[PDB]
Amino acid sequence: ALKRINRELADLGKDPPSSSSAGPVGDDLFHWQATIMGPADSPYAGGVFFLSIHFPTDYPFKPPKVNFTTRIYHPNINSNGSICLDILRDQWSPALTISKVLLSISSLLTDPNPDDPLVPEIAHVYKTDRSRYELSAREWTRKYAIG
Amino acid sequence: MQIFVKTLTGKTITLEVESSDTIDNVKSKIQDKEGIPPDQQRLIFAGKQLEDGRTLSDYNIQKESTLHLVLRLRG
Amino acid sequence: TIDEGLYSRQLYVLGHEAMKQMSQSNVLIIGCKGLGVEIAKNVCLAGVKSVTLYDPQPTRIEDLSSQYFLTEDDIGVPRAKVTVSKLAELNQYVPVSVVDELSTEYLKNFKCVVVTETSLTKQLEINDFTHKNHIAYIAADSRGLFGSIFCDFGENFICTDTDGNEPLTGMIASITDDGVVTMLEETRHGLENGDFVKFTEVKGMPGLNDGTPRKVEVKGPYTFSIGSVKDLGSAGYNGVFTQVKVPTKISFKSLRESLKDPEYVYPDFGKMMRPPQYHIAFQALSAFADAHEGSLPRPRNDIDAAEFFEFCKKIASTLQFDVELDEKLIKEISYQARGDLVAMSAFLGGAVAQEVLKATTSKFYPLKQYFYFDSLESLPSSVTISEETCKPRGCRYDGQIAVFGSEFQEKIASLSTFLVGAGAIGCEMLKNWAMMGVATGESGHISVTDMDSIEKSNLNRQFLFRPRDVGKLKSECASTAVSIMNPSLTGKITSYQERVGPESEGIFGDEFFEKLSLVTNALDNVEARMYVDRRCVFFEKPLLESGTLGTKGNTQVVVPHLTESYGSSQDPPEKSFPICTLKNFPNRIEHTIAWARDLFEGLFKQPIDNVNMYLSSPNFLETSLKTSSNPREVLENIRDYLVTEKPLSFEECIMWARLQFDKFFNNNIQQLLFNFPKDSVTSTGQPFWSGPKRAPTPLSFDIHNREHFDFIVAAASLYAFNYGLKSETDPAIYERVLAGYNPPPFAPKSGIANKDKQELKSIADSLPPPSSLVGFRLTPAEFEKDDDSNHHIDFITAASNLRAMNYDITPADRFKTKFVAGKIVPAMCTSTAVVSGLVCLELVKLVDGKKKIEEYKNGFFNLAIGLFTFSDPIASPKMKVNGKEIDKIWDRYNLPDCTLQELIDYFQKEEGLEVTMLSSGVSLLYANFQPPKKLAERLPLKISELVEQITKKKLEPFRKHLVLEICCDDANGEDVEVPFICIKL
Ligand SMILES: Nc1ncnc2c1ncn2[C@@H]1O[C@H](COP(=O)(O)OP(=O)(O)OP(=O)(O)O)[C@@H](O)[C@H]1O
Ligand SMILES: [Mg+2]
Numbered sequence A: 001a002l003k004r005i006n007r008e009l010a011d012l013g014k015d016p017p018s019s020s021s022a023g024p025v026g027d028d029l030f031h032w033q034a035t036i037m038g039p040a041d042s043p044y045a046g047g048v049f050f051l052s053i054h055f056p057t058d059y060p061f062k063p064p065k066v067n068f069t070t071r072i073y074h075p076n077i078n079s080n081g082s083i084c085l086d087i088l089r090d091q092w093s094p095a096l097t098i099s100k101v102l103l104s105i106s107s108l109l110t111d112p113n114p115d116d117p118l119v120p121e122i123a124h125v126y127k128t129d130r131s132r133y134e135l136s137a138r139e140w141t142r143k144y145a146i147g
Numbered sequence B: 001m002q003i004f005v006k007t008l009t010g011k012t013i014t015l016e017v018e019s020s021d022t023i024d025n026v027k028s029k030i031q032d033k034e035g036i037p038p039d040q041q042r043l044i045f046a047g048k049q050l051e052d053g054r055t056l057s058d059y060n061i062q063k064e065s066t067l068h069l070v071l072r073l074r075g
Numbered sequence C: 001t002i003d004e005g006l007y008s009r010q011l012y013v014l015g016h017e018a019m020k021q022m023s024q025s026n027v028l029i030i031g032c033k034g035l036g037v038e039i040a041k042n043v044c045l046a047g048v049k050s051v052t053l054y055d056p057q058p059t060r061i062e063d064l065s066s067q068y069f070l071t072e073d074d075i076g077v078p079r080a081k082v083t084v085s086k087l088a089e090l091n092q093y094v095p096v097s098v099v100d101e102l103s104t105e106y107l108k109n110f111k112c113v114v115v116t117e118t119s120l121t122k123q124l125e126i127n128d129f130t131h132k133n134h135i136a137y138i139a140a141d142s143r144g145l146f147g148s149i150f151c152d153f154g155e156n157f158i159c160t161d162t163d164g165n166e167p168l169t170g171m172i173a174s175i176t177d178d179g180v181v182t183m184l185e186e187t188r189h190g191l192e193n194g195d196f197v198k199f200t201e202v203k204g205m206p207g208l209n210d211g212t213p214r215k216v217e218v219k220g221p222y223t224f225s226i227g228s229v230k231d232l233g234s235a236g237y238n239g240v241f242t243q244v245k246v247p248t249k250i251s252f253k254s255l256r257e258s259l260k261d262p263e264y265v266y267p268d269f270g271k272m273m274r275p276p277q278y279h280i281a282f283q284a285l286s287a288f289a290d291a292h293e294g295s296l297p298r299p300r301n302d303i304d305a306a307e308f309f310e311f312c313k314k315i316a317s318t319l320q321f322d323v324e325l326d327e328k329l330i331k332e333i334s335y336q337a338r339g340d341l342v343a344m345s346a347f348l349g350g351a352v353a354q355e356v357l358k359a360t361t362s363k364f365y366p367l368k369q370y371f372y373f374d375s376l377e378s379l380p381s382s383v384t385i386s387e388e389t390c391k392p393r394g395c396r397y398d399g400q401i402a403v404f405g406s407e408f409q410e411k412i413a414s415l416s417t418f419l420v421g422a423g424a425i426g427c428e429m430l431k432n433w434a435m436m437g438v439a440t441g442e443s444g445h446i447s448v449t450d451m452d453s454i455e456k457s458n459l460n461r462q463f464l465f466r467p468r469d470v471g472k473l474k475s476e477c478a479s480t481a482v483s484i485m486n487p488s489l490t491g492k493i494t495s496y497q498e499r500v501g502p503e504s505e506g507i508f509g510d511e512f513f514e515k516l517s518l519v520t521n522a523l524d525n526v527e528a529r530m531y532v533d534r535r536c537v538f539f540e541k542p543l544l545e546s547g548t549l550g551t552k553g554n555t556q557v558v559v560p561h562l563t564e565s566y567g568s569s570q571d572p573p574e575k576s577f578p579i580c581t582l583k584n585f586p587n588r589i590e591h592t593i594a595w596a597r598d599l600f601e602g603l604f605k606q607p608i609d610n611v612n613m614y615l616s617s618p619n620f621l622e623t624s625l626k627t628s629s630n631p632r633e634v635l636e637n638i639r640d641y642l643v644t645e646k647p648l649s650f651e652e653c654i655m656w657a658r659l660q661f662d663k664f665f666n667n668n669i670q671q672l673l674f675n676f677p678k679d680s681v682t683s684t685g686q687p688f689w690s691g692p693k694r695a696p697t698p699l700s701f702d703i704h705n706r707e708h709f710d711f712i713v714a715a716a717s718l719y720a721f722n723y724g725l726k727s728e729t730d731p732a733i734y735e736r737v738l739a740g741y742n743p744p745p746f747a748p749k750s751g752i753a754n755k756d757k758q759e760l761k762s763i764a765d766s767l768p769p770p771s772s773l774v775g776f777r778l779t780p781a782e783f784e785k786d787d788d789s790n791h792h793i794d795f796i797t798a799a800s801n802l803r804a805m806n807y808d809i810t811p812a813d814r815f816k817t818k819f820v821a822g823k824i825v826p827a828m829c830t831s832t833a834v835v836s837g838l839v840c841l842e843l844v845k846l847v848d849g850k851k852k853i854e855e856y857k858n859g860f861f862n863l864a865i866g867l868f869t870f871s872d873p874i875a876s877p878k879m880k881v882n883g884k885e886i887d888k889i890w891d892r893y894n895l896p897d898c899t900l901q902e903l904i905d906y907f908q909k910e911e912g913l914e915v916t917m918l919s920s921g922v923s924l925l926y927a928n929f930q931p932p933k934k935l936a937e938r939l940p941l942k943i944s945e946l947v948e949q950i951t952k953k954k955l956e957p958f959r960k961h962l963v964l965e966i967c968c969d970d971a972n973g974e975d976v977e978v979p980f981i982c983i984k985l
């Protein structure tokens, strides 16, 4: 348990994130608070987003609870910060690591999936008026992801 | 040789391949033609799903064979 | 009229039809020894129409070796007469009678006939009549460590369900004209060749939607074939396939014909040559008994063994069996011919009861036909077993001494066990220990701990509890019952009411755990299992794990320094549906039930908790503003539930329920359809509402509909309970109030600075001050499935059915809603009996102190298909540490309470390893990447002081040790695992 946890915490430093910083919150390994940098080729460029990761007591036999903290205007993320993914929900094989989650969220930010959305209105805006979606994403990532 | 790949909507794509070609190369060609990521391509022939790491000859694919391409759905 | 308040757990295994047909079947039981009484108990708990007993032999003392309804005051009285009185109190719906004499024609009064402890000639006479009149006949026999079961349900038995599983259903991606059916992506149907399925809602091939079952040809894990569909159509898109289960005809043979040419059922493939031996052995045993006036061979007698072997040879020659008899095995059977164990009796009784249920309900696949079982590996090897030691002493333990001897009996009498839980498995374990005389010696002791209380639904499988005991603690009732059963256990049992967890370590401390001999788990959750496993590993005590699920069961044994712990094993996880599916696009009834549960939690539990916490914490708002994910939601809930929508009568509750109905079943659907119209297409051009996504449709409120009215009533009642008002159920008031309701207009919205904090502050200050409201508390609704007078399951069913009607899904009744929402685990009495028998057979192995790993057997079984399997336990993995052999699980480092620096130096100098991470509990005491200032501040402190400082909590006085997890790297930096550290305070 804490074995796994620490092994991954350690290899993280040996695996220069480049776009993350998963740091335990104080001295409770069961509650990390990582970070994600906005992709350059995305409307969310130049933004810092904080995420809270709560490891279940049965980790890695149960998926970690990853919730966004910085408000983000994305089709597949709701205001509560819940993340729409399968590696976190049902596809959580006991053969995964924080690295993967933290480059799969970056890939999601790279390109949303509006065909199976979590926020129907934002998905509709994205599908119909791309420019308005771009403007809204830039405004949100400037209001929240900056400062 | 030449083969035909049928999509879920009845479309037929003609591809020029060789019996020794790997599944990965065929998925690459299908991504080049339709833009579907290989990870989401599920190719089936004669009731058997083609798996990465093998060749067409492994599945006894011959002249003018017909495959079916279904697409995985993201979460 | 099935009493679902009593058979709640059983109906999830059998069903309504099975019990309806079962409540019309009569069972006759010949023989009332331990096996017979166990079968009778299980059948009575099952719920058959009635049970009749026939065993006129006078009671003897040795019969109490496996009988728990007999006392030493019953010597000389017929067993049936003294057993019926205690059997009649188990269930009030099952009358129990006794018949002095048995006549052949009388057998026509029963639907199933179980025969035990009867001579072979009488068995043949009964079978010759019960075969030609189509009566189920089950014959059971238990001799020491051997057991035989024979089943005969006639020559035209009809088995409706052959596996007990739910029909397989799935979705279709594409169907070719050649009958090639394809599943969705990474979807496995699980079908087998020869199965029948039917397709519905298939687009492009309506002909396949007729419903005619079709054959299945498995072509791959994801695809199969049905043949040729040239006439029906060209290509099919989407659809759902469902398997159809057809009844099968199974034909048995009479006993007389099957004696010559039997049909064995092999319970284990490692020993396949034994059943042919046992088949001869039991017939020879019956012949020897007939040749000695029904006197079985004396225990460990050589002459009787020789005579029995001669009889075996004669029978083998007579029957033209071309098998060479194994002398050692046959003579061992002869030695234990008079043995009578309670574990084997319970095991066989559970099995036979399940067979009776199969015979009566015509369900599941039965045994076909013979079943010979042995647990000869349980024979002790650390004690002297001879004729002198195994002779009876005229005591109630003769049936067990005759197998194990007096010395092993004394070993058992001095056990010091610890049983966790007092459920069904706990009750069976306690019964077995009481019968065996466990901890009846001077140094023996039993401890039983469980905090739950007895409920009505527990009486179906827990025979130690009576309806007059509803509402009391389980441990006290169990202790009293087992003291009544065995008076020798008066004062040798201690019953606690403490939950086994981190908070009970003040009682289950070092003193408590240092006197035990073994720990037996009877739990139903994985977390507590892991906790007990960790404790056993720390103290190095044998552990006995047992689990059941419907008709399936498994038993595992953990032995110190020999086998791996439970934690190494893992059960399959739980599939949590993606939030997108539940929130927006459901396609099954389980999604709707989960959505209803979440809605209930968000409407009746969380807001009340927020309101109560606001009036208690003086600084709640400030903490929530910077801690909670959605402070705005909390503020809105508090305002709405305090001032904006505080009801003053039940009519306002009805109005609020109507408004919530409109909000959740009429408005959100309109919004969703406004965002995604029914004719919308995806990016690839495919229709959006196709396949797993079903186009919804808003609902209009119609009071005359039953479901709408049920939802309104449930919501109003729950709201009134929350606000402590007086609820009503008369429809007149509802119809009067709901007539005068004006639906507010609603139109979907298309959308198109730092004042948010100002708005939140404005909302916050609107709330009345906490000082203004003193003593005003709202009652949160805590979900309770077992109570039928709180409208919880009613509300969940109403919400799930309404949401299903929204998306054209098949609605489910209250029964399945309660099954799914409440996470109810199906349970059976037969499975409990079998697991108890297996665990008690492993217990005698543990007592004997067997050292080899091939002599233990983890067991698995599935009673739906009569499957039994036993495998050797997995050996604990070894490793190389500092060029030495280290056990991964059962090894630790024992150190004093030295400073952290001294511990690091010890690990550097002794093991030659560099410590990189050191943790304890849920805290990271030391790490290699921490700032040097922190380490320099923490290095010169002792481990106990460091833990006290980091955890911000003083170590309790009862604490005497610390468990530290250490991850260290070698000289080259390569990570190497090391065993944990046991710091001694
Ligand atoms: N951590 C624990 N400490 C002590 N006893 C426990 C613990 N976890 C579970 N138990 C006990 O395990 C038993 C579980 O058995 P069982 O599931 O048959 O009973 P139940 O939960 O009352 O019934 P049902 O599951 O049918 O609703 C209960 O007595 C429960 O008290
Ligand atoms: Mg309970």
Ligand SMILES: [Mg+2]
Residues within 6 Å of the ligand: C524
């Ligand atoms: Mg339970």
